[PDB]
């Protein structure tokens, strides 16, 4: 935990709660995975915390640390750059994970709600120009899952756009209310767009 959206140059402290082994007998790691799925080594910490190791990449900006008492691993990022955007994991030492991630996102961009446009078989939805990428689309409050295809959002310029398509039966459509359910947690936005004929 400790993730989230941060503006370039910001600072942030990630944590890592261990249980199920002896946190003090192991060397810890911080490893990240960038959106383009590339894996990078961020930092290493000795069993007792006397030795630290970092690539040049984050040298002098990131600071790995731990609490053998409270069983905590820390990553203190400073002077964040756009390139630090990624999922961050921790692992015990060949790194043996146990972290489920925690997404850090460095961007100068401002949170902004989407706009939902109906698309009228196959219907579809158009969520356009929203920023903090987390968005959820379900049809008829999820009761209509199957034949659905939400496409990975692609960043236009400063905002995200994305499409979802449901393929129902033709006997069912205009005679039954079909609905696109968009939810943008990042700005407490929830929109219901009714796909209508003609």
């Amino acid at each position: 935990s400790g993730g989230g959206l941060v503006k370039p140059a910001g600072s942030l402290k990630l944590s890592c709660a261990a249980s199920g082994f002896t946190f003090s007998s192991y060397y810890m790691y911080w490893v990240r995975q960038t959106p383009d799925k590339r894996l990078e080594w961020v930092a290493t910490i000795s069993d007792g915390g006397s030795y630290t190791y970092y690539p040049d990449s984050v040298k002098g900006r990131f600071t790995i640390s731990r609490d053998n008492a409270k069983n905590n691993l820390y990553l203190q990022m400073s002077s964040l750059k756009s390139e630090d955007t990624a999922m961050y994991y921790c692992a015990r030492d060949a790194m043996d994970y146990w972290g489920q991630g925690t997404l850090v996102t460095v961007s100068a961009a401002k949170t902004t709600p989407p706009s939902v446009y109906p698309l009228a078989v196959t219907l579809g939805c158009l969520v356009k120009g929203y920023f903090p990428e987390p968005v959820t689309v379900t049809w008829n409050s999820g009761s209509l899952s199957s034949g659905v295809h939400t496409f990975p959002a692609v960043l236009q310029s400063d905002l995200y756009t994305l499409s979802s398509s449901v393929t129902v039966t033709s006997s069912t459509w205009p005679s039954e209310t079909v609905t696109c359910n968009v939810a943008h947690p990042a700005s407490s936005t929830k929109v219901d767009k009714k796909i209508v004929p003609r």
Binding site: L39, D56, M95, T122, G124, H149, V154, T161, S163, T167
Partner: protein, 213 residues
């Protein structure tokens, strides 16, 4: 820095076939190489430590071999629960490095694309934007070719595409193509075409509509 070149980037394989994934280090790395597995929406799993030492519990079908520069991770007879990413990482040089990875994908019969063109919603127009959306859905040979035709002439600029991972139910692919023009721009032409070429056919699938019906 030691760069690890994995190959190939992706590999289509049927359940039951056996595979060998390569990971070549740009320097005698020695036995210090390791393989990881990553399935969709899950963090990495260490499969093999130090080249041939597989971790307790990992199924027998996985086996790693190598020294110096070429390391291979074989899987004798792939199981459904094996499709995902495979990364190798070394541990004897300075910046601890990783490979870009190999995506193991599940081979299936060629599946024909189901195409749909959707003209801009009136709500969007009232905003002054006109997004023409086209969905190419549930095809298999991932390689598909989409073209846009505005009043018969090819249109490359302003096209945005997006693909999906292999569907965990029918192992097909899907993709959406979006052509974005302004309202003025959009209202200057009549017919809009989304044209798709694929392995499943010699002649392209084409779907179209005219602005004034």
């Amino acid at each position: 820095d030691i760069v690890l070149t994995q190959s190939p980037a992706t590999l289509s394989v049927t359940p039951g076939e056996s595979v060998s994934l390569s990971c070549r280090a740009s320097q005698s790395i020695s036995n210090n190489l390791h393989w990881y597995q990553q399935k969709s929406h899950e963090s990495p799993r260490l499969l093999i430590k130090y080249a041939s030492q597989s971790i307790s519990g990992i199924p027998s079908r996985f086996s790693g071999s190598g020294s110096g520069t070429d390391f291979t991770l074989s899987i004798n007879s792939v199981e459904t629960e094996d499709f995902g990413m495979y990364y190798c990482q070394q541990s004897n040089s300075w910046p601890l490095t990783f490979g870009a990875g190999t995506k193991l994908e599940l081979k299936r019969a060629d599946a024909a694309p189901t195409v749909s063109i959707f003209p801009p919603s009136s709500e969007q127009l009232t905003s002054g934007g006109a997004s023409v959306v086209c969905f190419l859905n549930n095809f298999y040979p991932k390689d598909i070719n989409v073209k846009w035709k505005i009043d018969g002439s090819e249109r490359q600029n302003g096209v945005l595409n997006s693909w999906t991972d292999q569907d965990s139910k029918d192992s097909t692919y899907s993709m959406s193509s979006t052509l974005t023009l302004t309202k003025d721009e959009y209202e200057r032409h009549n017919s809009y075409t989304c044209e798709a070429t694929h392995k499943t056919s010699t002649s392209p699938i084409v779907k179209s509509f005219n602005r004034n019906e």
